[PDB]
Amino acid sequence: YGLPARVRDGIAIITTAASDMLSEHSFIPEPKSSCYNTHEKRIYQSNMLNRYLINVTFEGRNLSFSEDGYQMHPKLVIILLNKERKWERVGKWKDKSL
Amino acid sequence: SIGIAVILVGTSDEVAIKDAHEKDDFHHLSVVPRVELVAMNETDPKSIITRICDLMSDRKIQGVVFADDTDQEAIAQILDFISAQTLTPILGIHGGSSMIMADKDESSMFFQFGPSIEQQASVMLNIMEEYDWYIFSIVTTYFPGYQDFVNKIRS
Amino acid sequence: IQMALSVCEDLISSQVYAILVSHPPTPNDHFTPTPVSYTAGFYRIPVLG
Amino acid sequence: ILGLQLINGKNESAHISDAVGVVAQAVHELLEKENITDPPRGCVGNTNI
């Protein structure tokens, strides 16, 4: 899982979350994004965006997020250190399987 | 009319990402991509903060993803600080962005990648059963967020 | 909001050893005490409220 | 009602007096051990700890 693989998925996460926002609400106000003289406030429904950023999915792959801010469906890889210092794959864990 | 730029810090070189991303931007969806690749060779927080704040102050950007290759365990909270006060989404993929966080702000739509602290113990317990290691003891330090680990074990 | 970058440049650059942060004149706000501790955290600089 | 209040809660003029005094003791005792590394100067050049 390399840098180009994760970068492309990352933008797809936000874009597909914006699609249904433009489908139902379609009234994004583009709040003033400026730390200098931050006169903007949370008058609009920016908080409602939290609900639609949780069940984000793409390419048929469940890329949902947890409340804490974790994807909660990761792909852990188990590695081992040999007699000489070198990391090598041992096994994979997915969906509570080994 | 919303674009999602990407910020990258480190020695890693990646130029053609924008070209691939533009062709792989899912043109069937109304995304209006405005991806910009910005690179710089320092990890100073405030210097990075100035660049981030100025990033969408000049142009119109409403989303950013931070990529890095470093062991500095302080950059993740900075995005939380920015995302809390500035109502813009922030997503973490690699490096300091993707690491365990104690707790976020009450109103902070920040998200990261990587396994949770709770999920680490569960997978670790499912490898100490096929190899029959039923006798074990635990030693850990005062690193923040360690309390739930022993609590997860006992549950 | 801009104090985060306004603290280190104006104060930390002076080769300081600790930071003394005052109380906001408002009766109760997190606007003041929050950024004044984030800046020192990167360098583990002590801060005293 | 049986309320509660704390003494000397808003006279920060004496409070800053204690704060500068107590840290003054720390620095005097600080300058008795080797490996006194200079804290970072400048908010751009240095990014380490």
DSSP codes joined into one string, C1-49: --HHHHHHTTTGGGT-S-EE----SSSS-STTTTHHHHHHHHTT--EE-
> Which of C23, C21, C1 shows the shortest CA–CA distance to C12?
C21
Instruction: Evaluate whether A13 touches A63 at the Cβ level (below 8 Å).
Output: yes
Test A74 with B109 for CB contact under 8 angstroms: no
Q: Tell which of A8, A13, A14, A77 to mutate to test the B interface (max B CBs under 10 Å).
A: A14
Instruction: Evaluate whether B5 touches B34 at the Cβ level (below 8 Å).
Output: yes
Q: Which residues of C touch D43 (CB under 8 A)?
A: 5, 8-9, 12-13
Beta carbons within 10 angstroms of residue B59's beta carbon: 11
Q: Which residues of C touch B45 (CB under 8 A)?
A: 39, 42
Q: Which residues of C touch D40 (CB under 8 A)?
A: 12, 43
Backbone angles phi, psi at B144, to 5 degrees: -60, 145
> Which of D16, B39, D41 shows the shortest CA–CA distance to C23?
D16
- Chain C residue with CA closest to B75: the answer is C42
H/E run at residue D29: helix D12-30
The identity of residue A28, as a single letter, is I
Give the closest of A18, A53, A93 to B123, CB-based.
Answer: A93
Close Cβ partners of B45 (under 8 Å, ≥ 6 residues apart)? B74, B75, B78, C39, C42, D47
Smallest CA–CA separation between B144 and chain C, in Å?
Answer: 15
- At A23, list the tokens: 């489908």
H helices present in B24-92, as ranges: 45-58, 75-85
Close Cβ partners of A58 (under 8 Å, ≥ 6 residues apart)? A9, A12, A13, A16
The torsion of the CA quartet B104, B108, B114, B119, rounded to 10 degrees, works out to: 50
Angle at A57 between CA A18 and CA A78, to 5 degrees: 135
Instruction: Evaluate whether C7 touches B81 at the Cβ level (below 8 Å).
Output: no
- Annotated binding residue at B27? no
Chain B residues 37-96 with CB within 8 Å of chain C: 45-46, 49-50, 53, 74, 77-78, 81, 85
Q: How far apart are CA A58 and CA A64, in angstroms?
A: 9
Q: How far apart are CA C49 and CA C42, in angstroms?
A: 18
H helices present in B86-136, as ranges: 117-125
Q: Note every long-range contact of A13-18, with CB atoms under 8 Å and residues 24 or more positions apart, other chains counting.
A: A13/A56, A13/A58, A13/A63, A13/B91, A14/B4, A14/B63, A14/B89, A14/B91, A15/B4, A15/B25, A15/B26, A15/B29, A15/B31, A16/A56, A16/A57, A16/A58, A16/B29, A17/A49, A17/A52, A17/A53, A17/A56, A18/B2, A18/B31
> Which of B93, B79, B68, B97 shows the shortest CA–CA distance to B10?
B68
Query: Any CB–CB contact under 8 A between A38 and chain B?
Result: yes
- Chain D residue with CA closest to B49: the answer is D44
- At B39, list the tokens: 């690179």
Q: Between chain C and chain B, are at least 3 CB pairs below 8 A?
A: yes
Q: How far apart are CA A18 and CA B2, in angstroms?
A: 9
Which chains have at least 3 CB atom pairs separated by less than 8 Å from chain B?
A: A, C, D
Q: How far apart are CA A21 and CA A28, in angstroms?
A: 8
Test B93 with A6 for CB contact under 8 angstroms: yes
Q: How far apart are CA B37 and CA C28, in angstroms?
A: 41
CA C36 centroid distance within chain: 2
Close Cβ partners of B121 (under 8 Å, ≥ 6 residues apart)? B149, B152, B153
Beta carbons within 10 angstroms of residue B155's beta carbon: 7
Collapsing DSSP states into helix, strand and coil, what is residue D39?
coil
Close Cβ partners of A46 (under 8 Å, ≥ 6 residues apart)? A31, B87, B109
Instruction: Evaluate whether B78 touches B48 at the Cβ level (below 8 Å).
Output: yes
Q: How far apart are CA B66 and CA B79, in angstroms?
A: 9
Smallest CA–CA separation between B141 and chain A, in Å?
Answer: 23
Instruction: Evaluate whether B99 touches A43 at the Cβ level (below 8 Å).
Output: no
H helices present in chain A, as ranges: 3-24, 49-52
Report the b/e string of A29-50 with b at 16+ CB within 10 A: eebebbbeebebeeebebeebe
The residue behind tokens 């360690």 is: B146
- At A17, list the tokens: 């979350």
